[PDB]
């Protein structure tokens, strides 16, 4: 049984977000960032139980549904406004080389035939993609640190990272790189 | 099958149509519900009418929420007597009271051009009222030449 305590709160959070979402489309979707293309590792953190329908399509687009997942994205003028919608449920920050290389090595999962298999062999890598210029995991590792045209498939190949929940360890520029070390 | 009429006031901001329906539907079957709003802007007057399928489950719901502190409001839940209910309580049941932008529509209706004959009756309404204002302003002792 659920109380009228939660009903008023849920409708208050919904009108606050709808105003902020309709703030965002009505205003110009421009961020105070240089136009040079950069890379973001972005992590879903549970903001509110109910969810609005424009982020519903775009969170399925980032396949970011389960609790405490992460994925690597590349910022454009498009991808910024995708990020500039989904702020309260996600954390965005620039990765470092030690953080990215560990995360895939500790937790590396790939997608073939709708299955979540680990990353056990580099022969599996060539059986999966093969003809895209990649030769091992380190080829994908280099592809993350400097974005190439084939990063679109490498993001599609890579499963979302199911990290562990930390026990207490909007924008944060280096604090998310502290958050990966606390919760990996 | 006797329905119950229950009056809820001191309504917190955000305890509107669907949440007021969603809360007391857990108590019992709801026939219809209408919180009154304002004509000029869509805005609740913090008072609502809700009707139950059974009168006995209305008295249970009203006495369990009679004095309740919720978001800084001590809501008053009270059952309206069946002889003291106007049958036109639900001319607007279960629909939307849409926030009509009255000021915007009336404001720009001035700005779309009219008919040429409509301009002359605009002037015809105009010159008869400046003389009328000039007549009452002659008593103070100021006159306008134009």
């Amino acid at each position: 049984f659920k109380r009228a305590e939660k009903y008023v709160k849920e409708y208050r959070e919904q009108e606050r977000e709808k105003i902020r979402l309709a703030r965002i489309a009505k205003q110009q979707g421009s961020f105070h960032i240089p136009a040079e293309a950069k890379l973001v590792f972005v992590i879903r953190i549970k903001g509110i139980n109910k969810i609005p329908p424009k982020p519903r399509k775009i969170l399925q687009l980032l396949r970011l549904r389960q609790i405490n997942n992460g994925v690597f994205v590349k910022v454009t003028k498009a991808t910024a406004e995708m990020i500039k919608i989904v702020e309260p449920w996600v954390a965005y920050g620039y990765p470092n080389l030690k953080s990215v290389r560990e995360l895939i090595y500790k937790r590396g999962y790939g997608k073939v035939n709708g299955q979540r298999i680990p990353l056990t062999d580099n022969a599996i890598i060539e059986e999966n993609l093969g003809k895209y210029g990649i030769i091992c995991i380190e080829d994908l590792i280099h592809e993350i640190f400097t974005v190439g045209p084939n990063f679109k498939q490498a993001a599609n190949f890579l499963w979302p990272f199911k990290l562990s929940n930390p026990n207490g360890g909007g924008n944060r520029e280096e604090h998310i790189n502290a958050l990966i070390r606390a919760m990996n | 099958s006797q329905p119950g009429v229950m009056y809820i006031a001191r309504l917190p901001h955000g305890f509107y149509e669907h949440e007021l329906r969603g809360y007391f539907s857990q108590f019992g079957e709801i026939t219809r519900l209408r919180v009154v709003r304002n004509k000029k802007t869509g805005a609740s007057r913090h008072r609502a009418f809700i009707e139950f399928a059974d009168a006995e489950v209305a008295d249970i719901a009203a006495r369990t929420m009679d004095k309740y502190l919720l978001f800084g409001h001590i809501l008053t839940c009270k059952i309206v007597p069946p002889a003291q209910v106007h049958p036109d309580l639900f001319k607007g049941a279960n629909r939307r009271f849409k926030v009509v932008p009255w000021n915007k529509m009336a404001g720009r209706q001035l700005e779309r051009p009219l008919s040429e004959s409509q301009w002359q009756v605009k002037v015809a309404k105009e010159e008869q009222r400046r003389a009328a204002r000039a007549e009452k302003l002659k008593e103070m002792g100021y006159e306008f030449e134009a």
């Binding site: 049984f1 | 108590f27 019992g28 006995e56 249970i60 369990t64």
Partner: peptide, 22 residues
């Protein structure tokens, strides 16, 4: 029917007044 509605109303009143936990 009527007894079931009275029972579910008393259960809802008990949960709203005393809670669901224990």
């Amino acid at each position: 029917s009527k007894a079931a509605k009275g029972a579910q109303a008393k259960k809802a009143a008990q949960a709203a007044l005393k809670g669901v936990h224990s």
